[PDB]
Design an enzyme around this catalytic site. Structure first.
Site, PDB file in Angstrom:
ATOM      1  N   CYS A 199     -10.260  -5.129   1.471  1.00 22.70           N
ATOM      2  CA  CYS A 199     -11.381  -4.205   1.541  1.00 22.70           C
ATOM      3  C   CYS A 199     -12.268  -4.430   0.313  1.00 22.70           C
ATOM      4  CB  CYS A 199     -10.890  -2.756   1.606  1.00 22.70           C
ATOM      5  SG  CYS A 199     -10.315  -2.065   0.050  1.00 22.70           S
ATOM      6  N   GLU A 241      -3.145  -5.103  -2.718  1.00 22.45           N
ATOM      7  CA  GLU A 241      -3.746  -6.027  -3.676  1.00 22.45           C
ATOM      8  C   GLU A 241      -3.819  -5.421  -5.070  1.00 22.45           C
ATOM      9  OE1 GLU A 241      -4.764  -5.188  -0.514  1.00 22.45           O
ATOM     10  OE2 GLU A 241      -6.647  -6.255  -0.140  1.00 22.45           O
ATOM     11  N   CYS A 278     -10.841  -3.475  -3.185  1.00 21.95           N
ATOM     12  CA  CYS A 278      -9.870  -4.443  -3.680  1.00 21.95           C
ATOM     13  C   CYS A 278     -10.555  -5.709  -4.184  1.00 21.95           C
ATOM     14  CB  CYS A 278      -8.861  -4.804  -2.588  1.00 21.95           C
ATOM     15  SG  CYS A 278      -7.506  -3.622  -2.412  1.00 21.95           S
ATOM     16  N   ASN A 335       0.841  -1.187   0.000  1.00 20.97           N
ATOM     17  CA  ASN A 335       0.000   0.000   0.000  1.00 20.97           C
ATOM     18  C   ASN A 335       0.879   1.240   0.000  1.00 20.97           C
ATOM     19  OD1 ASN A 335       0.566  -0.939   2.727  1.00 20.97           O
ATOM     20  ND2 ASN A 335      -0.813   0.659   3.499  1.00 20.97           N
ATOM     21  N   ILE A 336       0.440   2.244  -0.751  1.00 22.82           N
ATOM     22  CA  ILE A 336       1.163   3.498  -0.895  1.00 22.82           C
ATOM     23  C   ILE A 336       0.190   4.632  -0.611  1.00 22.82           C
ATOM     24  CG2 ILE A 336       2.432   4.974  -2.508  1.00 22.82           C
ATOM     25  CD1 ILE A 336       3.102   2.325  -4.041  1.00 22.82           C
TER      26      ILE A 336
END
Ligand SMILES: O=C1CCN(C2C[C@H](O)[C@@H](CO)O2)C(=O)N1
Ligand SMILES: O=C1CCN(C2C[C@H](O)[C@@H](CO)O2)C(=O)N1
Ligand SMILES: O=C1CCN(C2C[C@H](O)[C@@H](CO)O2)C(=O)N1
Ligand SMILES: O=C1CCN(C2C[C@H](O)[C@@H](CO)O2)C(=O)N1
Ligand SMILES: [Zn+2]
Ligand SMILES: [Zn+2]
Ligand SMILES: [Zn+2]
Ligand SMILES: [Zn+2]
Lengths: 131, 131, 130, 130
Positions: free
Chosen positions: B86, B55, B89, B42-43
């Site tokens: 989530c 993901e 995703c 994650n970014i």
């Protein structure tokens, strides 16, 4: 790395685009300080809110690989003049790129426009604002 | 490539995470039909809506490289039990992965839960609904 | 207010949709515990990732007004069967709605499917996991 | 309904903010050509990508109600100088607002900065490019 080579990469990246809904393909190429290139393209989804843009794809691939130092970013789409990065992409660019990174905008007919990360989104919202 | 190896990839991928705002790091590893692995993390961004998830990063990386056939996706985070993808995703997963792809969920303590796309998102909205 | 009346609101909300790019209009109507209704519709943008969905519009409208307790949400679109909320919307619903809220899915021809947040989104990711 | 009154609205709107994750509240007030005001605030989610911003809640509430003609938009947050709309919001603003709409930026200190939609996001990506 003269911008022309990076532009060539962005144009190739554009062909990988998954944009069956808009039929608008965008390509991007990101050059790291060490000279490594990361390609990116827009990837759409039936539920429009999930769409990921070329500029972000290139930046996210770099970052997720450990590369966080950049010098130049090229973006290309089939528009009359150089393609214009959307606001959301400019925001992501202002966060992950130093203010000196060069942004090279172009299309599929040789029109080129260049600007720094700062000039793209002046007075951008940033982590500093969160106090 | 066993699922235990993919999990280790996701765990490694997790360390590349750029989550200075939530301090919650997530990693993912996508396995193509040909055995290639794509890592994702994650970014985040100072402007929260920009954030990209692990993901999605792995999937976008793969697709932008020409790989569109997958068999397994692993996801890991430091949660009580296996991390839960989530909804956004799951939506991207249902669009880019075939209904048979195996989704391996886990955490930082060996807890593993496995499931297929359809089970992940029942009767997902799709391109079919746009006619 | 029964689901039939909430559906009537979702259908009206659907006409306010700003979907010039996909041409796919979606409407939603959220009913608070106090009986107030909030309408929502999808609102698109030339830069696709900025698109807001009907379910989210209705929920955001309610919350930004101070209403945070809901009992039912209706969603409608022009699909052969009841419209299916996308994953992102299911996620926002699981976060802003209690697990008991009734989600009423329908289309423009009377087909109705009802369900819970939980079955809508199995073991949803939540703030507990942080 | 001068600007100081719209600013007041944005300040009130800010209190409705649901930002338990960033603790950074933002409020916005949109004034239609007919003088109606729509309030907006940021609404967060455990899954960060879903977060909706104040500028976008106000515009989405207006549009989902049938109002598409605007004249002024005020935005306020607790920042050193006037709050700076993020790129995503500027994009939504350039799409839903005419180029002449006045954007009033401020904070809790009375510092005010004003600018046009075009100035906020020069040569913005648009539907014409598609
Ligand atoms: O910043 C630019 C502007 C928008 N496009 C997108 C998203 C979508 O898939 C398509 C149509 O907007 O191009 C980009 O990928 N980058
Ligand atoms: O689907 C999962 C759940 C959410 N996280 C994120 C985004 C954000 O940076 C952080 C907190 O939600 O984890 C992911 O990256 N993937
Ligand atoms: O979750 C549902 C399914 C999708 N639509 C949307 C967004 C977009 O404007 C259009 C095409 O996906 O319908 C919704 O608004 N809600
Ligand atoms: O354009 C502005 C800048 C960002 N904030 C947000 C989203 C998030 O909930 C919080 C922290 O960035 O403020 C806004 O709501 N509007
Ligand atoms: Zn963009
Ligand atoms: Zn996610
Ligand atoms: Zn949705
Ligand atoms: Zn914003």
């Amino acid at each position: 790395m003269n911008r022309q080579e990076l532009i060539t990469e962005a144009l190739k990246a554009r062909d990988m685009a998954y944009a069956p809904y808009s039929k608008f393909q965008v390509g991007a190429a990101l050059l790291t300080k060490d000279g490594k290139v990361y390609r990116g393209c827009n990837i759409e989804n039936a539920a429009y809110s999930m769409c990921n843009h070329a500029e972000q794809t290139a930046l996210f691939k770099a970052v997720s690989e450990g590369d966080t130092e950049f010098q130049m970013l090229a973006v290309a789409a089939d528009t009359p003049g150089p393609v214009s990065p959307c606001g959301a992409c400019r925001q992501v660019i202002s966060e992950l790129c130093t203010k000196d990174v060069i942004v090279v905008l172009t299309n599929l007919q040789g029109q080129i426009k260049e600007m720094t990360v700062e000039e793209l989104l002046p007075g951008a919202f940033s982590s500093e604002d969160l106090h």
